[PDB]
Amino acid sequence: MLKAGVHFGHQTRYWNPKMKPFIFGARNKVHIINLEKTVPMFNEALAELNKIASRKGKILFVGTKRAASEAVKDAALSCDQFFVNHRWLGGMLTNWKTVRQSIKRLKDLETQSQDGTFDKLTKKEALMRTRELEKLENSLGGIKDMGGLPDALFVIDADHEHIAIKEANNLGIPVFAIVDTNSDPDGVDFVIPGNDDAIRAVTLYLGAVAATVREGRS
Amino acid sequence: SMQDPIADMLTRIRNGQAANKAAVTMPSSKLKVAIANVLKEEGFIEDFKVEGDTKPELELTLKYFQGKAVVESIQRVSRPGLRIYKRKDELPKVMAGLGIAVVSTSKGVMTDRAARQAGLGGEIICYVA
Amino acid sequence: SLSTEATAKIVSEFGRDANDTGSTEVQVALLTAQINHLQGHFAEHKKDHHSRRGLLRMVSQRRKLLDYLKRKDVARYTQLIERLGLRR
RNA sequence: CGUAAAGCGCACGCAGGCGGUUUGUUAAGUCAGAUGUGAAAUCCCCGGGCUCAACCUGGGAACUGCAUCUGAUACUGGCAAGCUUGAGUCUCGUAGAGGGGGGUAGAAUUCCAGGUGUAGCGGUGAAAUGCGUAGAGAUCUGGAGGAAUACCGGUGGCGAAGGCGGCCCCCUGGACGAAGACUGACGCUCAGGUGCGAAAGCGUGGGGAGCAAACAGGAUUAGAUACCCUGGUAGUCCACGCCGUAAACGAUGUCGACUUGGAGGUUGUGCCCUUGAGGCGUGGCUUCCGGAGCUAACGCGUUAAGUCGACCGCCUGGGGAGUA
RNA sequence: GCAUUC
Ligand SMILES: [Mg+2]
Ligand SMILES: [Mg+2]
Ligand SMILES: [Mg+2]
Ligand SMILES: [Mg+2]
Ligand SMILES: [Mg+2]
Ligand SMILES: [Mg+2]
Ligand SMILES: [Mg+2]
Ligand SMILES: [Mg+2]
Ligand SMILES: [Mg+2]
Ligand SMILES: [Mg+2]
Ligand SMILES: [Mg+2]
Ligand SMILES: [Mg+2]
Ligand SMILES: [Mg+2]
Ligand SMILES: [Mg+2]
Ligand SMILES: [Mg+2]
Ligand SMILES: [Mg+2]
Ligand SMILES: [Mg+2]
Ligand SMILES: [Mg+2]
Ligand SMILES: [Mg+2]
Ligand SMILES: [Mg+2]
Ligand SMILES: [Mg+2]
Ligand SMILES: [Mg+2]
Numbered sequence: 001m002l003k004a005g006v007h008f009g010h011q012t013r014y015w016n017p018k019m020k021p022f023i024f025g026a027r028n029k030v031h032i033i034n035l036e037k038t039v040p041m042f043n044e045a046l047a048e049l050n051k052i053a054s055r056k057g058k059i060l061f062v063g064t065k066r067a068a069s070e071a072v073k074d075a076a077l078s079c080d081q082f083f084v085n086h087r088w089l090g091g092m093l094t095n096w097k098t099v100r101q102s103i104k105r106l107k108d109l110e111t112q113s114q115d116g117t118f119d120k121l122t123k124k125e126a127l128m129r130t131r132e133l134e135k136l137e138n139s140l141g142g143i144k145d146m147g148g149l150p151d152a153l154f155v156i157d158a159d160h161e162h163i164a165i166k167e168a169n170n171l172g173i174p175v176f177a178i179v180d181t182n183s184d185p186d187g188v189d190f191v192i193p194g195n196d197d198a199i200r201a202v203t204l205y206l207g208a209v210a211a212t213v214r215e216g217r218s
Numbered sequence: 219s220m221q222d223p224i225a226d227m228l229t230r231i232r233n234g235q236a237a238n239k240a241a242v243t244m245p246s247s248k249l250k251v252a253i254a255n256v257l258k259e260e261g262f263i264e265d266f267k268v269e270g271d272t273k274p275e276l277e278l279t280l281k282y283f284q285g286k287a288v289v290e291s292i293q294r295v296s297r298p299g300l301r302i303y304k305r306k307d308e309l310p311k312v313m314a315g316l317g318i319a320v321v322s323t324s325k326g327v328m329t330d331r332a333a334r335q336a337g338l339g340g341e342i343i344c345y346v347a
Numbered sequence: 348s349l350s351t352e353a354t355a356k357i358v359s360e361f362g363r364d365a366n367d368t369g370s371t372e373v374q375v376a377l378l379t380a381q382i383n384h385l386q387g388h389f390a391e392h393k394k395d396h397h398s399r400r401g402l403l404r405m406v407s408q409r410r411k412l413l414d415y416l417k418r419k420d421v422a423r424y425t426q427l428i429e430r431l432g433l434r435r
Numbered sequence: 436c437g438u439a440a441a442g443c444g445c446a447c448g449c450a451g452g453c454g455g456u457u458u459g460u461u462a463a464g465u466c467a468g469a470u471g472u473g474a475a476a477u478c479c480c481c482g483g484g485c486u487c488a489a490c491c492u493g494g495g496a497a498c499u500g501c502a503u504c505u506g507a508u509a510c511u512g513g514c515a516a517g518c519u520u521g522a523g524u525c526u527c528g529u530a531g532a533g534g535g536g537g538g539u540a541g542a543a544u545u546c547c548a549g550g551u552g553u554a555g556c557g558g559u560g561a562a563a564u565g566c567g568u569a570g571a572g573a574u575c576u577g578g579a580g581g582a583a584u585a586c587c588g589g590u591g592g593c594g595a596a597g598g599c600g601g602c603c604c605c606c607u608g609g610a611c612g613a614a615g616a617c618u619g620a621c622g623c624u625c626a627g628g629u630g631c632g633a634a635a636g637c638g639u640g641g642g643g644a645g646c647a648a649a650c651a652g653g654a655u656u657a658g659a660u661a662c663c664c665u666g667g668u669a670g671u672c673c674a675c676g677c678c679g680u681a682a683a684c685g686a687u688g689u690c691g692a693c694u695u696g697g698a699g700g701u702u703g704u705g706c707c708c709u710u711g712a713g714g715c716g717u718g719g720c721u722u723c724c725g726g727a728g729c730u731a732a733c734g735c736g737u738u739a740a741g742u743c744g745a746c747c748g749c750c751u752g753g754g755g756a757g758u759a
Numbered sequence: 760g761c762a763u764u765c
Contacts, residue, residue: 368525369618397534401608415621
């Protein structure tokens, strides 16, 4: 609901003219979002996500900024959905069949680590190849078990993750994004105006969406 | 100097449609109201209004369908530098009848279809798509 | 350009009253007064081209106003030129 | 028509083209109908006849035009009365290398006279020509003369363009702001025409410190009619007149309307005002980066090369040739 | 410092 936080936008000189409808005022040289307008749109997106969750769809969370890398993982653990909390590799979806091999490598690398066959006297086997695990785990760990393209995209910043937005539009996947004053609209089907970096705001967003999916999933 | 109030009028709709403006305002005139009156008839503009007596101002409420401008294209045909007069049988059709050309007949400003039905010619003002 | 005292005198002489500064005769009279005054200026400043450009602007403006006055009503135009002693 | 061929160097302007808004009136343009005419053939459409076809032939349409008559009055034009937003005048202020004339100051270069003083100075990649024991260069004092105005000085300002920098006075043009009053379309553009127009150049008469085509010498080089060096005339300066050309460039004609933004500079102005080398608005000019859109691309992008309108200029493969 | 040509 219309609680504290979120309303704090970016500085006026970094604003994007396209979101003139969604701004309320330039308080203290900082734009503040029209919350009363945000709530109907936020609820709409939440309702749409529930409908997508109702049909056993898959929604993937995209947060790259350090302020949200840890939070998105918690959302992916509260529910059973997927996420990307580090750098979003170009072509995650356009050529998913190419990175699919990279996912397979994790399954083999994970198998050796868990089964103990990598515990050999050579440090090339023990360290040189094992270090690739977190390299691909921190990079593809949250996308391991998608098994294909998602059914909806949740983005914490429509501009910082502009690469993710562009790929979703090309594939036609529905896009839900937290769009801050400086971000670019018209690339997101359902735009959620508000702050993207405030910890109390990001936690509320991913925490809120993580609840509708579970009830919608039933 | 401003020599084409009609052309400036049409330009504002074209510019307003491109900019996704809800409405555009400009100085009012009986001829402009005549053009504005016909345009509202077919649904190209949601409505028009005139405000002021000594300084009348014409405001047109533009409309959009599926997020794109309803007026696909609008161009001035008759100009002060070169004016166009068509007979009853020479009335043009825009987009093979999907569009309409505003014709200033002796009975008043009306669409080409109306002028053809009434059987009068006159000035071809503009084409609306 | 022209002193305020001289400007007021012309306005009160050619116009209907002292606050009617828009009358065509007033405008022509003001321009004619300055043009006549500048005659001495360019008599000795023969090479002063930049200010001479402004003078021709007043000359052209006066001719444009006179033509309008003639078109609207010849009667007043004939009287105005006689009093100003121009159009020779 | 920014860079491929193409925006006059820039202005003022007659003829011409075009023109804000309201009412009445005219019915010229325009539109409708009718009449006369638009020869026949040909083309055209439906038929007929040569065995079919070509060909011939009946009727129709067509001949997009012109003239007259009868009507319509939206639009353009004519006429009459209006209106204030275009444009212009007035009042009060502000900034500025805007222009013309006169005066004056300081630093510096060169030259002239004199003192001190002794063997070098000057110059180059190196060197020499050159200057100097007839006392140079250096250093100090006085004097003469010409030119340009360090710092300020800034993609700062002004002007139509060219262009315009010390200070002061005289004459003078334009621009902008604040409200208020006044005229009431008096406007925009412009062939021909006319005016202005860097530098170089030409004519007459002055002036001439520095700089410097030409020219001379010394070098460099295979040569060096150059680059470098030492000298140096016209010119550069002033008055008047002529020349009218520049990559005279934003390689982008002028005027008006419309169309997301961001950061500065410059020059007015309103307002909150005690919590000032403050806070929020509103004009003019100007620099940079960028959105839609546009463009062959580069890029332009509210100061358009975007979306429109009025008028003018100009282009039509390269060379020959902006030449005969 | 100078230093051409195919
Ligand atoms: Mg070229
Ligand atoms: Mg060219
Ligand atoms: Mg030019
Ligand atoms: Mg008119
Ligand atoms: Mg008639
Ligand atoms: Mg015939
Ligand atoms: Mg037959
Ligand atoms: Mg026949
Ligand atoms: Mg009329
Ligand atoms: Mg000419
Ligand atoms: Mg010269
Ligand atoms: Mg000379
Ligand atoms: Mg001489
Ligand atoms: Mg020399
Ligand atoms: Mg030329
Ligand atoms: Mg120049
Ligand atoms: Mg330049
Ligand atoms: Mg040119
Ligand atoms: Mg002009
Ligand atoms: Mg740009
Ligand atoms: Mg020649
Ligand atoms: Mg040879």
